[PDB]
Amino acid sequence: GRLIYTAGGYFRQSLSYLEAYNPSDGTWLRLADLQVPRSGLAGCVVGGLLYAVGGRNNSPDGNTDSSALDCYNPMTNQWSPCAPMSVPRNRIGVGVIDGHIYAVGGSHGCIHHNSVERYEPERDEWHLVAPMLTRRIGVGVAVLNRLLYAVGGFDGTNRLNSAECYYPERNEWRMITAMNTIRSGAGVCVLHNCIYAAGGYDGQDQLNSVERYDVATATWTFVAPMKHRRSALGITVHQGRIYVLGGYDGHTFLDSVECYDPDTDTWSEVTRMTSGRSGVGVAVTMEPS
Numbered sequence: 001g002r003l004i005y006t007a008g009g010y011f012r013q014s015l016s017y018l019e020a021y022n023p024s025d026g027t028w029l030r031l032a033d034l035q036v037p038r039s040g041l042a043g044c045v046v047g048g049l050l051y052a053v054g055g056r057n058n059s060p061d062g063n064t065d066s067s068a069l070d071c072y073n074p075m076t077n078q079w080s081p082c083a084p085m086s087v088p089r090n091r092i093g094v095g096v097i098d099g100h101i102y103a104v105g106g107s108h109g110c111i112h113h114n115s116v117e118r119y120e121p122e123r124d125e126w127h128l129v130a131p132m133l134t135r136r137i138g139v140g141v142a143v144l145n146r147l148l149y150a151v152g153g154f155d156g157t158n159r160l161n162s163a164e165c166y167y168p169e170r171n172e173w174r175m176i177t178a179m180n181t182i183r184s185g186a187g188v189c190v191l192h193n194c195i196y197a198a199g200g201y202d203g204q205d206q207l208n209s210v211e212r213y214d215v216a217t218a219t220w221t222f223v224a225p226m227k228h229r230r231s232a233l234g235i236t237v238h239q240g241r242i243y244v245l246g247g248y249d250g251h252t253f254l255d256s257v258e259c260y261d262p263d264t265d266t267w268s269e270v271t272r273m274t275s276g277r278s279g280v281g282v283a284v285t286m287e288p289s
Contacts, residue, residue: 001287003029004238006245007052007072009277010039011253014058018072020287021257021271023238028274031288032077038066040232042094042141043281044101046121049073052281054085054092054106065090065108069101069119069126074288083124086117091185091232091279093141095148097168102129104150105136112137112156116166130171133164138232140188142195144215149176151197154184159203163213179220180211187235187244191262196223198244198260201231206250210260224265228256234282243270248278 003020014037020029034052041055050072056065065088071080089106096102101119103126105112112135117128136153143149148166150173153159161182164173179197186200186207195213197220199206206229211220230247233254237243242260246253253276258267 002238002284003287004236004243004245005043005050005283005285006234006273007043007050007281008034008038008041008055009234009246009280010058011275011277013037013060014039014056015277019274022287023270026271029288032072032079035070035079035081036066036068038068039279040091041066041279041281042092043234043283044094044096045283045285046096046099046101048285049121050283050285051082051101053094053101053103054089055279055281056088056090064088074286077288083119083126085126086128087113087115089113091138093136093139093150093188095141095143097143097146097148102141102148102166104141104148105132105139105153107137110156112154130166130173132173133175134160134162136160138185140183140186140197142188142190144190144193144195149188149195151188151195152179152183152186152200159184159201177213177218177220180222181207181209183207185232187233189235189237189242191237191240191242196242198235198242199226199230199233199247205229206231206248224260224267226258226267227269228254228258230254232278234280236282236284238284243282245282246273246277246280252276253278
């Protein structure tokens with residue numbers, strides 16, 4: 001039994017919520033709050049543990065970007081801090097290769113990062129690796145065949161349709177074919193052996209289009225678009241299907257959750273979150289005990 005976990009996010013302030021959706025019985029389980037409210041974070045899973053990486057605390061007190069790494073154990077319903085990153089990374093992207101967490105890009109105040117670093121859970125250590133060719137805030141990140149892809153984002157001045165690929169063995173980034181559409185804060189994931197980039201923001205419109213990258217042909221192809229335009233959505237994959245959570249449509253912080261069926265190239269709304277938010281971290285792991 002795997003659930004879809006959503007951590008943090010933003011609605012009027014940064015949020016502490018951890019909630020887990022059960023796509024079979026439809027419920028949302030309310031779980032242990034994050035230690036610190038965070039929006040603009042990313043989520044991932046290594047060895048069954050849920051990790052919340054980076055982000056930013058927008059509170060009535062003040063606003064602070066976050067270098068924090070925190071670990072949630074479904075067996076105990078408890079969060080535990082980890083070693084933090086070398087720098088705060090708001091609107092971070094993250095990917096998992098060989099049991100290590102890669103932290104990609106993001107911002108710290110007016111610094112737009114091109115740096116990247118790698119966490120090793122077995123030693124609770126971060127180490128910087130080769131920086132990207134591009135500064136990317138709101139970057140989407142996905143892992144295909146043990147290669148790390150950084151897709152889209154915002155360089156501080158321009159929103160981006162470029163994508164690059166990191167080779168861990170080589171510690172090098174290499175540009176790949178650009179997307180058709182400019183997207184910052186899109187949801188990016190790997191479904192079968194394709195990288196999907198859904199939604200986002202191009203500096204004028206929040207987007208509902210979705211495109212898919214095939215490594216064999218090295219090109220991006222549009223698939224069916226989402227029902228709702230959304231930037232800063234959360235995305236994950238559960239049992240062969242893509243789920244997108246919340247986001248911001250230019251007027252509203254969405255509670256809509258949509259589900260993509262690749263076999264039918266169709267999106268459908270499947271649930272509503274308990275309250276609308278953007279900038280959540282999302283990942284899938286076993287239900288709690």
